[PDB]
Amino acid sequence: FVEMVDNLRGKSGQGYYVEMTVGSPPQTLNILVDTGSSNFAVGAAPHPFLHRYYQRQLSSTYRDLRKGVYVPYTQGKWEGELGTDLVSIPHGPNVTVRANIAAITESDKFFINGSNWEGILGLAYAEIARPDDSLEPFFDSLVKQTHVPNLFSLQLCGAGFPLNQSEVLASVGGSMIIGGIDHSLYTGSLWYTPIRREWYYEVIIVRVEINGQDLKMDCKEYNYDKSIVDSGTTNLRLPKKVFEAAVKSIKAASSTEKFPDGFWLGEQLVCWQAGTTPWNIFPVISLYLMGEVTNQSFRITILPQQYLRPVEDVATSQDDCYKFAISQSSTGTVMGAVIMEGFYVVFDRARKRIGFAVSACHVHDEFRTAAVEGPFVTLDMEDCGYNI
Template identity: 30%
Template sequence: MLKMRYLYGVLLQILFLLHYVYCEDFNLFGEAGQAYALVVYIGHPPQKLHVLVDTGSTTLAIAAYARKDSNIYYHEGNSTTLYNSGKEVQAKYSQGTWSGQLASDFIQFPSLPSIPEVRSDLALITKSYKFFMNGSGWQGLLGLAYLPVAAWGENVVVGSWLDFLEKSVKKPMSFELKLCGTQSPVNATHYGKLTMFDDNNATEIRDFVYRTPILRKRWYEVGVLSIRLLNTTKSNNLTESLKGNKTSDFNLNTINIDNCRELNIEKSIVDSGTTSIRMPDAIFRQVVNELRNSAQVSNMLILDEFWYHGEAACWPEPQDWYLPSLAIDILSTEADNQYFTLEIPAQNFMRVITARNNTAATGTVSEFCYKLGLEAGGKETVLGYTAMEGLQVLFNRSAGWIGWKESSCGPNARVTGPFNTTKSLLYMCQLTEQLPDVNVSIKAAQWTLCAISIVAAAVLIYLLAPCIKMFFIRPLPRSQQISLSQAALVEQET
């Protein structure tokens, strides 16, 4: 009887997952902590591989060698259309590095039928360090950010697949991520959908009321105004009292200006290739201290190693989390004194990493393990996919904004607002004082070097003017005598 119940439960789970996988038409999949992967065909004949969809990088990078944990990789010799330049390229991420060679081949995504096959640059990874996770089901990255943060080498930059696509279709392209998380409390596999469309015919764009400007087109850098907990008496930033008004006075009574500036002191980015929500160390400690206190009030016994050191906590059954939601206040595109709020439930950041329900001779053996989806990020702020699950996020690259709306799948995340302040958030949070884009910096350096070269040449000509003048007024015969070659001088000596 026990075995029959177990088999029945497994059958229900399979039917449940099949319903979501096929009825919802998902094309993104991933195991716990491994982000969301997409199937790609590379070369002719096509080789099927899996790549992480990563808004925190730019390059399409593919493993081109067998690893200890996986023998699935791109075989150069099996593609008749591969061109390998032999030029060395490399990339460094917040976790891990790789090096390889710049190449190009035909790229196609079978789950995106409206997107044509295009020849694109790609990096063939031949060596890596802490880049591929043990047992990962993916073999590379599909970078969807801007060119200034692409992989590079000596006098070479790896082009972006998105840029090659836009050149091919002659239209600017946008993409939407619908990340649904896990579909069952007893399963750690998560699902999502990537959709792409050109900006001119995208009716979906009008559905996104809540938009934030991309402050710098390198990564997807945005203005994060605060990260705080809802329904708590202590708030490090915009208070809950503001929710009732729609208008608030932006001063030290309602916001911690130092925290607002600290969140953006290095960069604040939206990164689907990162799991957790990262925040500056001091703000992380404040948020986690409040979460820990809320858990203690709810009589939930969780050790400090879970809250502060990234260790897992396990129970014999799935957990229902009665913890406050996380609120992330983000600058709006509508006005520099307007913002909206992402409300992230505890189901998002109390992340399931293991969901086992096995039947043994002694009965049912269960283990459900969780990790905290919040991290201390030093000086940077990163909204990983933990902040995106339960929402639909549209990246409009050409117009320079990111849209947010509530999703039909996943956790019960919400978007609320808009809320107004009486003063400029750009000015108060020092969002206008960021460094210029990398490509602008390169152009400025080139012009500076050009100007210096012109000045140096002018000074050199001025100093050499007497010598040049004497050279031109010398008689012709004498000029011929001093123009003898080194070989002629040797012959004369002989």
């Protein structure tokens, strides 16, 4: 398992990527890790934003399905050619497997400059694959073709201040452990919440509190229409009613200071003389998630450092500058990277639950700690889940 520690690199802004090799002989590539999609896909053709790409011509083993696919993401989109080839992770477990790959030909707004990741890995379930479930998402392949246990665990570590793409290469952000939990990673005790439906890593959120204040919205409200855990997404996204709720609540705590109401949307960043940033104004939000026991639940708490995100200088002077990491959503809540940076998150597919624990690499506020705590009592939790 040590073999796999620290494999990951990246930031919330541009995603965390892992190194994989595809085809025979193997071609090295860096792939985005996404739990928001179940589709494995890569660049097979030259692009401005791409250092390297998949050339099937060289793979001896590249196999072709004579099919075409199109993939939709709230932000990017791409369409490509389905094929299968041998695939491996150097810094993963010591195995190689043949899995469906899509060679991307046309893309919109998928690739990111200096992201340094030329591919995407969707670790979500089949139902959401494209074109249809039939196509087997990669991890399933791995499990099927090997003795890898059916779980993976993700620790995502996030920088103090903006990191350059060149800097990111030097920089390391995370560890992804496959078919495993590595205890060194985390502290305290994992707390697990069920996976409501095996498509996105959907979850039910029962209570929300900011600085101990309960929004006291209807619990369905939080999960409308769903709450899913996504490393795909940079920012924590909340349904409109919920989002507006926090924002009012957050603003109050922070009222003392002037932020362009533009900031709250998160279009534009706010700058503070380096090291003077007043966190204290900022609230800590507790999300309470379903227990694995009757009428039980637990909560995880977010420091602002979590949802307020560092971005680099707008001027050739240094004032720590930050952006607002919380985004309105009309597709239900998404617990994105910023949320997942705090904690060692385990996707226990086998036991169909996801477990959260405090990340070893957790950012510091002398006075407050991100933590995961249990157990709690919540009543009629199910009523919280959403049904049309």
